[PDB]
């Protein structure tokens, strides 16, 4: 059974950088890609960042472009979502998924994490 | 499974006038025979047109919140003229069903209805040890029927504990708004016996759940109606008892 | 090679004999584990007899396999693997035993005491298995009251169909050294036929 | 007595044997069978029955009816497929829950062709064109339209015909493939892209869905009966 | 020796088997059989023999000859039947003690028709008419003449013919019925009412009796051999 | 039951028997066999395949490729053979490591003929003549040319034909010979001598080599299956 442990969540500040990670069990991370999907309170399944382990070819969503950084580790079978310069709109319960690969689409994936809640706290 | 594409609009209005009834079907063609069998006679009193004619159940509103609907046979048609009578005056009874489900909308509405006929459709209550459980009356909601939910039949569990996606094993048709307006399901008698008692045992089970949501253009009709016309086919009953008039 | 027209499918069969119905259930699986014993002492719980109602519904393996269908007819072949052993840590002795297995047809008197008249059954079959030989085997044909066995029954009257009850005791009498035994029953549904399939039970029972 | 010799194998019990044993109830009148519609002869027959694929098994949409609803939203023409699927039966969580897959988890091999049928569920007036693509085993997932375009693909028109049927052929190294996750024998990819785009008249809802179906063919066969039942 | 293999089931004893064993007394002259009248071939044959029903098993009349005497007394024309009987074999204390019932307590099912014969035992001069009624399975007991009149009934005239024969047909849900008390499969009712009344000339005793008989037909069969013998 | 009698030998296990036992996997689709080139029918066939003899198993040349290189050096015409070989299979360390010998170490006897083929591997220009000699079983090793000359010998010319084939016949006392060292049945000798000498033109290297091959014939057979496998 393939397991993805969504780790790196919490309530940081507006502009407060927060990295994310997922331990990929059950398969060779290279055969798959890996991405991120956020969903705001009562909203929809929306994409953020995803890259393929083999080609390491980046792809971000238009609204998140720049501030977010995705990076894979083939040694520890983990992904690193460097959500830097956060904004009050980035307050959406995140999720990670291994892809076939490769890009941020509707669903287009299969293995889904439990869900980590990140809240871009602002004064 | 039902990958057909008749025409798309309307061509030919050809009415089915059996006995006293009249239907005026969208067309005639595009019908599914359950398992490839036509309702035949036991190889008895055969009423024919007397019992064999079209009866229409109550019309129900399909809405953007609807979870589904379900009925039982002969159960629903227990309050239908001669077929309602012959059901209580006999200890026996076997019958076929021409479930003709109609649903009209405009070229502006979108969605998809899957009419599923589940033979021996017992409803949700995970007590394997003690099934049937829910009272005779609840299990039998007559002509008004019962409804699925998001006696409690869960929609994705087809209201029996099995994933909806596999429902496609039972005879069915998909009333897809952009194509078909009508659904025709001929269900032959299916039970462990040659003939049985209708009052107690439910042969089939018509279950119409929404596969696609309902979306209407800007402002239009907030809801669309679905109608179920059912008819007893090649039926027989043995043997009149003190025509115990009610 | 590469092709995606829309034809029927492509070619014709390609050998599918080991997948067929008869061959799908040709395997006999465990259905229950009955525990008897030959005590010298008055143990009323384990008291010689062991009663078990013949039902597939107890185990999982053979249960889910039968659930892909609604109706079935099947010649039920049963085998009994009996195994014994001493309970007490004593160099006590015992003579090779005999057990009496009883296939009691559905709707008959279920034995209570191992002393009652219903344990003599002038009509009901019995099997005297001497320990230390090839396991006992009987064939019970389609004993259904209907034209088919209904796995899922919709309507009112879960007793299912009732395939009867099995009762076993030690035929040999009270020996000072208490020996416990376990009877494993297997079911092979030969000559099986099925009708109207449903989606498989996804979850646990 | 007739000179007989007991060879090895006597008094053993082979669970999968086939022997004639004593019949416990002599002369018992067995109730004759009636032609109840729907008699099944072999398991492969239940596979040739189209079954809806739960494509969107997302965090919230899995184990809910939404897993069957692939929604064509209002997003930019990015050659990012709307949906991609691995032609690897038990080695992919989507093809597994289908009646087809349910038959495959009881064998070790699988051969023949398979057919994916897409049914559009949008307004009659709505029109557009999509490209359903297939990439044979071992090939990398087609991530661009241009990429997917080169291989076996069908250009499915929404405007005209509502249902597309793409029969995936038998382009396999081994005469018999693994139902398990193997690189020596790995499926391939079935993906859909925006050939054109979605065109809706007036103010009709801009988001509709598409359902998917899967089944086997006459040449589809299986072998080595195995199981997986837990407690 | 000829290579033979001992399979499971060897050395066991099936009480209901059928094997050829050694004959203890070789060449023993068996006394030839003679055609003694009354050879029986099957049990169903003993059922097709009319046997008197003990209708009145009342507190004092049961286990005495009076249980067989149904007396038509001098009482008001109340549509209260003179006698009513449940067509439920072992699920009714009256049909049980008949030779017919005695055959049914050795099986689980019973099929076919049955025939109730009523023999009037009153003065030749005495006349009148009665209505023997039948109410098929599941129907409520006919408690009024009018009620009983609607269903299958025979209008038996005392004045003319002394014996009435009402053959109860096969109006059954299951192809095979329960000999036990079941609501899924419950018999029905056979009841008699005063069509007219009893007319006696001069000073002839105003109270006579009627006997009842029951038997099976050619289509009557049974199955699943069981027992019930106590100590 | 049919009167049968258990004779001696029941319940024993003969490793080399041949009995029909139960098949663990009924109806299992066995993958059909394809004509893969090189099907073998019998072991004697692998023997009729010429295999290079490692003649020079000297202290340093053994277990190295040099064991296959018989070098004709620049030495005096001494009737001392260049090479001599014992026609005694497992009773001589040279014929043993050949595919031929590898078949013989699995039996007790060997019959028929054998063929030794010598291939010269020197300059085209180089010429000369050699005498390949055979001395039947029991005879003393031919140590002089004159001695070897008297018996069955071939006068192999280097100048003309590069390869010599000398078929050793079946001159044996017993119809079946020992593969072991026995004096009752001992092979014989195959030896080569300088008929003439080696003549090389210009300054071409004065030392070349010759390879040897050995195989069986159609009449070559073996018996009594034995083994020799250690740990």
| Structural class based on helices, strands and sheet pairing of chain D | mainly beta
In angstroms, what is the radius of gyration of chain D?
Answer: 24 Å
* Count of helical regions of chain D: 3
Number of helices, counting only DSSP H or I runs of 4 residues or more of chain C: 2
Beginning-to-end CA distance, first to last residue of chain C: 45 Å
The assigned structural class of chain C equals: mainly beta
Beta-strand percentage of chain C? 35-45%
Q: Spell the H/E element sequence of chain C.
A: HEEHEEEEEEE
Shape of chain D: elongated
Number of strands of chain C: 9
Which bin fits the share of residues in helices of chain C?
A: under 10%
Q: How far is the first residue's CA from the last residue's CA of chain D?
A: 52 Å
Q: State the major sheet of chain D.
A: 5 strands, antiparallel
Number of strands of chain D: 15
Identify the quaternary structure here.
Answer: part of a larger assembly
Shape of chain C: elongated
Largest interface: pair, residues per side: C-D, 62 and 62 residues
Beta-strand percentage of chain D? Answer: 25-35%
Note the main sheet of chain C: 5 strands, antiparallel
Evaluate the radius of gyration of chain C.
Answer: 22 Å
Molecular structure report:
The structure is cut from a larger assembly and holds 1 copy of chain A (123 residues), 1 copy of chain B (246 residues), 1 copy of chain C (205 residues) and 3 copies of chain D (231 residues). Chain B is mainly beta. Chain B has helices spanning 81-88, 136-139; strands at 32-33, 55-56, 60-62, 69-70, 94-103, 109-117, 172-176, 182-187, 206-216, 224-230, 232-236. With 205 residues, chain C is mostly beta strands. Helix content of chain C is 5%, strand content 35%. In chain C, 39% of the residues are buried. Chain D is 7% helix and 29% strand. Chain D is built from 3 helices and 15 strands. Chain D has helices at residues 44-47, 99-104, 145-150; strands at 2-6, 39-40, 51-52, 70-72, 83-86, 109-110, 114-121, 127-135, 153-157, 163-168, 177-178, 189-193, 198-199, 208-216, 222-223. Chain D starts with a strand and ends in an 8-residue tail after the last strand. Chains in contact: A-D, B-C, B-D, B-E, C-D, C-E, C-F, D-E, D-F, E-F. At the C-D interface, helix 1, strand 3, strand 6 and strand 9 of C face strand 2, strand 10 and strand 15 of D. Strand 9 of chain C pairs antiparallel with strand 2 of chain D. Chains D, E, F: Forms an icosahedral capsid of pseudo T=3 symmetry with capsid proteins VP2 and VP1. The capsid is 300 Angstroms in diameter, composed of 60 copies of each capsid protein and enclosing the viral positive strand RNA genome.
